[PDB]
Design a binder for this molecule. Structure first.
Ligand SMILES: [Pd+2]
Ligand SMILES: [Pd+2]
Ligand SMILES: [Pd+2]
Ligand SMILES: [Pd+2]
Ligand SMILES: [Pd+2]
Ligand SMILES: [Pd+2]
Ligand SMILES: [Pd+2]
Ligand SMILES: [Pd+2]
Ligand SMILES: [Pd+2]
Ligand SMILES: [Pd+2]
Ligand SMILES: [Pd+2]
Ligand SMILES: [Pd+2]
Ligand SMILES: [Pd+2]
Ligand SMILES: [Pd+2]
Ligand SMILES: [Pd+2]
Ligand SMILES: [Pd+2]
Ligand SMILES: [Pd+2]
Ligand SMILES: [Pd+2]
Ligand SMILES: [Pd+2]
Ligand SMILES: [Pd+2]
Ligand SMILES: [Pd+2]
Ligand SMILES: [Pd+2]
Ligand SMILES: [Pd+2]
Ligand SMILES: [Pd+2]
Ligand SMILES: [Pd+2]
Ligand SMILES: [Pd+2]
Ligand SMILES: [Pd+2]
Ligand SMILES: [Pd+2]
Ligand SMILES: [Pd+2]
Ligand SMILES: [Pd+2]
Ligand SMILES: [Pd+2]
Ligand SMILES: [Pd+2]
Ligand SMILES: [Pd+2]
Ligand SMILES: [Pd+2]
Ligand SMILES: [Pd+2]
Ligand SMILES: [Pd+2]
Lengths: 173, 173, 173, 173
């Protein structure tokens, strides 16, 4: 209790929930990544795109935890539920699932920001702005762009389009 | 009056008060620093920790003054009261006094931010966020950590614990 | 099914279970790390030791998943249960909990190796040997050493001993 | 006979057979490589992929021979039969033939390892593990991945898919 100042029990609880959501997202991306690495799926560009996102979500959770400790709150961890699917279908299906996931994280961030604004907590506000809200927007725009390109490349020749997208948009170094 | 825009007389007065509080804090840290440099106290790690904080508070006051001029307000200086003590007791006593001081500065920042939000002044809001609120949080967490370690090192052997903290946590380059 | 060769359904299931155990361990270390970063605990050496172990357990899970895909098995993820404690007591308590955890992972590795030897699967054997069994042994020896030193430093002056261990054994760069 | 120790006549014979199988494989890859270099086939990415595999199989045979001499066994060479085909069809046909070949080599390695484990010959075991079993697994996963991508790229437009795979997956420096 020695440092805690202007940090409500409600914000503290909502930051712990958000941490669980970011770790859940990280776990979802780990599964997406290993799915595309299956010898019967074998799209390497799609597998590391999803593995970079896993790392990013884990880092987001870690930033939230550091902040919680900086404000004198107490981290409380809960079970992490498994990803929503065991098999993720096509690149199109996966990118759709990813956007749905990012939008749910975005909405949780907005819900937390609204809470902090109602709680008169400008530090929370500035933290969430500078570290999460803009990265989320940029990420969702990128996924939106990917999805449009995937979608354009379907019809008639789906195997061909899925290969070319991975080779020409996704793949790497 | 040629540039001043959306900058109330109330915010202007509160920024001048905050400048006085930061200079008061800087002066308090100058005294803490020279106290630990006394030949009958002689803890050099504690003396420069407090001298870096003096510089930081002075710079915070200077940032506020620059902003006041940028917005077309007018700096007005008042007498600076002397620090609350002439002798600061133990490292434990001093770190406690320092935390009390930072928390009072933090609360003044929150009070100013609330004022600026009530005044519809988003520039003030962004200024205080990006430059003061987060640094204050980080500083108070660091002092909290120090205090916990000091506290742990007492009982039975206080001289020994105060020496070891200065040597092993504080001291320097 | 195009590549899978000499890889039983039993080994595949046991590798998925082991992956869950390594991720659980990683999560346990994340919680231990943030616990020691609390302003009312404030032992930084203990916090990053535990954060390096979190990364190591995550990497172990990832190595297992890559192997599973190399052999044509299918990764299946389950819920990750939360760590066994919300508060981890002293450095001594924490190091004890860590050793218990590593020994349970070690035993799971031995159980999997025995399975693979009973299944006539020399690739599994060589994989587990070269990548997990020796690292586990080395890690447990290191934790054992830490625990002995912690234990030596208690009696009479526990706060002092816990500070000195963190400063002189643990802490860092 | 001056050095030979714990090395059975049965293992020695099986190592000579395995050497013949690796040289046969190397010869098969030499033929696959020159087939794709025909002016009426002309897929350069597919031709050097197969030429790197020829070199790798030759090196595997050479490693086995060196080991045989290290253990005091005697290399005995037999006729090398010609590859199973004179013309290898499409890239798809060829990659399928390659996987069949690697899996037969893998099975021969497992059969030799089982022999050495039944013969109480831990050196053989460690040799085969560290030098052959893992490389074989990794190679077969890579071929599996290739085959999946080839397969995806067929239907309707086979010429186009075979060109794009060679250009975008296979080809080189
Ligand atoms: Pd506290
Ligand atoms: Pd991958
Ligand atoms: Pd990648
Ligand atoms: Pd990847
Ligand atoms: Pd990658
Ligand atoms: Pd990348
Ligand atoms: Pd706000
Ligand atoms: Pd905000
Ligand atoms: Pd704000
Ligand atoms: Pd003016
Ligand atoms: Pd000094
Ligand atoms: Pd100093
Ligand atoms: Pd000094
Ligand atoms: Pd100094
Ligand atoms: Pd310094
Ligand atoms: Pd505002
Ligand atoms: Pd603000
Ligand atoms: Pd604002
Ligand atoms: Pd398969
Ligand atoms: Pd830390
Ligand atoms: Pd550390
Ligand atoms: Pd740390
Ligand atoms: Pd660290
Ligand atoms: Pd380290
Ligand atoms: Pd074995
Ligand atoms: Pd083994
Ligand atoms: Pd073995
Ligand atoms: Pd001999
Ligand atoms: Pd060629
Ligand atoms: Pd080539
Ligand atoms: Pd070639
Ligand atoms: Pd070439
Ligand atoms: Pd090459
Ligand atoms: Pd063996
Ligand atoms: Pd072996
Ligand atoms: Pd062995």
């Amino acid at each position: 209790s020695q440092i805690r100042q202007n940090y409500s029990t409600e914000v503290e609880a909502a930051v712990n929930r958000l941490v669980n959501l970011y770790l859940r997202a990280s776990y979802t991306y780990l599964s997406l990544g290993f799915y595309f690495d299956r010898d019967d799926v074998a799209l390497e560009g799609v597998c590391h795109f999803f593995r970079e996102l896993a790392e990013e979500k884990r880092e987001g959770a870690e930033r939230l935890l550091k902040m919680q400790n900086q404000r004198g709150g107490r981290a409380l961890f809960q079970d992490l539920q498994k990803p929503s699917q065991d098999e993720w279908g096509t690149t199109l299906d996966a990118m759709k699932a990813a956007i749905v996931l990012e939008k749910s994280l975005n909405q949780a961030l907005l819900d937390l920001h609204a809470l902090g604004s109602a709680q008169a907590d400008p530090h929370l506000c500035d933290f969430l702005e500078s570290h999460f809200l803009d990265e989320e927007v940029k990420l969702i725009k990128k996924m939106g762009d990917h999805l449009t390109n995937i979608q354009r490349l379907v019809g008639s020749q789906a195997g061909l389009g899925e290969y070319l997208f991975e080779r020409l948009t996704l793949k790497h170094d």
